[PDB]
Amino acid sequence: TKQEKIEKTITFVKHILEKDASGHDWYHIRRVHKMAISLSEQEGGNRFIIEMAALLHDVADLNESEEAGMKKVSDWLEELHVEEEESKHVLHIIANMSIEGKLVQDADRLDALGAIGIARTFAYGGAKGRLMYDPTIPPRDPSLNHFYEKLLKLKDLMNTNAAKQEAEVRHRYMEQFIEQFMKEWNAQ
Amino acid sequence: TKQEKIEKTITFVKHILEKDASGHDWYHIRRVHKMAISLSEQEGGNRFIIEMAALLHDVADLNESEEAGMKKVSDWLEELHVEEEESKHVLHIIANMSIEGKLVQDADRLDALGAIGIARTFAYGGAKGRLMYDPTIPPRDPSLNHFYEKLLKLKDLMNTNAAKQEAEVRHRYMEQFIEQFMKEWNAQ
Ligand SMILES: [Mg+2]
Ligand SMILES: [Mg+2]
C-alpha cells in the first residue's frame, strides 16, 4: 500500500541524510511534511503526492550538483513503483521547490516564520558572527533586521487558505515578539 | 552636580570599552542602568549610588585580573570626587556583582529574561555550535534546554517588588514562547 511507501520513503530520506550532511535536517523535513498533511486535510489535493513530494523536495536541493538530484528522486519513485501518471507529478513540484504542489510550498514557506524562525535567526546570527540588534543599522547587518528584511513579508506569499491562516497567526507572533523585544531594549 | 558626574561616568565606561573588548557591551550596561532607575523610582534607595553602581559593575568584572578593577573604579570615584561616605557604598555592591545594591542586582539579573534572553540564547547557541532543540536531550546540550536549565528559575531570585513584578511578566513570555515554539516543532 501507499502508506507503506510513504513510510519506506521516510527511511529513504532519513538515511541519505546520514551518508553526508546530517540526520538533523530531518526535523525540518518532517515539520513541513506533517504540516503539508494538516494543510491538505483542509484544502484538498492528493495526499500521497503531497506527502511524497514534501518528503523529497530537500533530497534534490547540497544533494550533488544542479538537476543531478532529479534523477536521484526519479529512479527512486521507480523502485517504489509509482505510475508515471503520479510520479510525473510528484517529482514535478519537487522542481519548483497545482493544488498538491501549492500546498507543499505553503507547508515549506510556513516553516520559516514563528518562534522557530526567531530562533533560527538569532542562531544563524550567532554562527555568522553578528549582533542581535543595532539602532545604527535600521531595517531595509544585525539578526533582528533580517525579520523585516525577508521574513515578515512571507505571509503574503502563502497560496491556500489554511496556510494563509496559520501564517497570519505565525506572522503575528513575530510582530508581538519584536514588540516585546524592543520595549526590553529600552528597559520598558 | 551629581548628574554631571553620572554623565561623565557614562563617558568613562563608554570609553574604556573601546580600548579593548567592544563598545557594544554598552547597550547592556545601559539597559540595566535605565532599568535600575525605573526600579528605584518605585522602591526607594539612593539614586546616585544605584546609578553610579549599575554603571560600573561591569568595569571591574575581562577588565584585568581578579580584584584589580576594584582599585580601577576606586581611584575613579576619586577623580569625580565622591565622599568616601558614599563611594564606600558605591564601589561596595560593585563587588557583589542594602536596598540600593539590592536594586542594582535586580536590574542586572532581569536583563537575562524576556525576548532578549531568548535571542541571546539561540544566538550564543549558534556561535557555540549547537542545535536549538532536540527531543533526545531533555531538560536538566541544545539552546532551548538552557531555558529550564538556568533561566526560568531567575524570577525567583529577584529582591525588590518592582523587579519581581517585571520578572513575572518577562518570565511569563519565555514560558508562552517555548509554548509557541513547541507546537510549531510538532507542526500544530
Ligand atoms: Mg525546505
Ligand atoms: Mg551585568
Q: Tally Cβ neighbours within 10 Å of residue B100.
A: 26
Show the cell assigned to B32.
540595566
Identify the residue whose cell numbers are 508562552. Answer: B176
Please indicate whether, in this complex, the C-beta atoms of A180 and B173 are within 8 angstroms of each other: yes
B57 vs B60: CA distance, rounded Å: 6
CATH number of the domain where residue B180 is located? 1.20.58.1910
A122 and chain B: CB distance < 8 Å anywhere? yes
Residues of A in contact with B163 (CB under 8 A): none
Nearest chain B CA: its distance from A84 CA (Å): 31
- Both B187 and B167 in one domain: the answer is yes
The last residue of one of the domains, among B47, B69, B96, is: B96
Q: Is A28 annotated as a binding residue?
A: yes
- Both A64 and A46 in one domain: the answer is yes
In a 13 Å sphere around the CA of B72, the CA atoms on its Cβ side amount to 19
Q: Is B58 annotated as a binding residue?
A: yes
A166 vs B142: CA distance, rounded Å: 27
CB of B154 within 8 A of CB of B171? yes
CB of B159 within 8 A of CB of B45? no
Q: Tally Cβ neighbours within 10 Å of residue B148.
A: 14
Please indicate whether, in this complex, the C-beta atoms of A126 and B131 are within 8 angstroms of each other: no
Of A108, A75, A82, nearest to A93 by C-alpha is: A108
Residues of B in contact with A24 (CB under 8 A): 131
CB of A71 within 8 A of CB of A147? no
Residues of A in contact with B118 (CB under 8 A): 118-119, 122
CB of B60 within 8 A of CB of B73? yes
The last residue of one of the domains, among B36, B66, B96, is: B96
Amino acid, single-letter form, for residue A174: M
For residue A69, give every residue at least 6 positions away whose Cβ sits within 8 Å of its Cβ, in sequence order, or none.
A59, A60, A61, A63
A48 and chain B: CB distance < 8 Å anywhere? no
Q: How far is CA B156 from CA A90, B161, B163, B167, in A?
A: 54, 11, 10, 9
- Both B23 and B47 in one domain: the answer is yes
With the CA atoms of B65, B68, B72 and B75 taken in that order, what torsion angle do they form, in degrees rounded to the nearest 10?
-170
A143 and chain B: CB distance < 8 Å anywhere? yes
- Both A84 and A142 in one domain: the answer is no
The last residue of one of the domains, among B56, B74, B96, is: B96
- Both B90 and B26 in one domain: the answer is yes
CATH number of the domain where residue A87 is located? 1.10.472.50
Collapsing DSSP to helix, strand or coil, A37 comes out as helix
Collapsing DSSP to helix, strand or coil, A42 comes out as coil
- Both A85 and A148 in one domain: the answer is no
What determination technique applies here? X-ray
Q: Tally Cβ neighbours within 10 Å of residue A42.
A: 14
Amino acid, single-letter form, for residue A73: V
Resolution (A): 2.9
Q: Give one DSSP letter per residue of chain B, joined into a string.
A: -HHHHHHHHHHHHHHHTTSSS-TTTHHHHHHHHHHHHHHHTTT-S-HHHHHHHHTTHHHH---SSSTTTHHHHHHHHHHT---HHHHHHHHHHTT---HHHHHHHHHHHTTTSSHHHHHHHHHHHHHHT--S--TTS-----TTHHHHHHTGGGTTS--SHHHHHHHHHHHHHHHHHHHHHHHHHTT-
Give the DSSP H or E segment for A165. helix A161-185
Please indicate whether, in this complex, the C-beta atoms of A27 and B185 are within 8 angstroms of each other: yes
The number of domains in chain B is 2
A94 vs A61: CA distance, rounded Å: 9
A143 vs B172: CA distance, rounded Å: 24
Please indicate whether, in this complex, the C-beta atoms of A173 and B186 are within 8 angstroms of each other: no
- Both B109 and B91 in one domain: the answer is no
Look at phi and psi of residue A114 and say left if phi exceeds 0, alpha if psi is from -120 to 50, else beta.
left
Q: Give one DSSP letter per residue of A53-113, joined into a string.
A: HHTTHHHH---SSSTTSHHHHHHHHHHT---HHHHHHHHHHTT---HHHHHHHHHHHSTTS
Residue span of the structural domain in which A46 resides: 1-96
CB of A181 within 8 A of CB of A123? no
Identify the residue whose cell numbers are 503539508. Answer: A36
Q: Tally Cβ neighbours within 10 Å of residue A188.
A: 11
- Both A112 and A32 in one domain: the answer is no
- Both B64 and B29 in one domain: the answer is yes
Please indicate whether, in this complex, the C-beta atoms of B125 and A129 are within 8 angstroms of each other: no
Residues of A in contact with B119 (CB under 8 A): 118, 122, 132, 143-144, 181
- Both B185 and B104 in one domain: the answer is yes
CB of A187 within 8 A of CB of A170? no
Burial A117-146 (b: 16+ CB within 10 A, else e): bbbbbbbebbeeebbbbeeeeeeeebbbbb
- Both B102 and B188 in one domain: the answer is yes
For residue A85, give every residue at least 6 positions away whose Cβ sits within 8 Å of its Cβ, in sequence order, or none.
none
Identify the residue whose cell numbers are 531555558. Answer: B147
Burial B38-57 (b: 16+ CB within 10 A, else e): bbbeebebbbbbbbbbbbbb
Please indicate whether, in this complex, the C-beta atoms of B119 and A34 are within 8 angstroms of each other: no
- Both B188 and B102 in one domain: the answer is yes
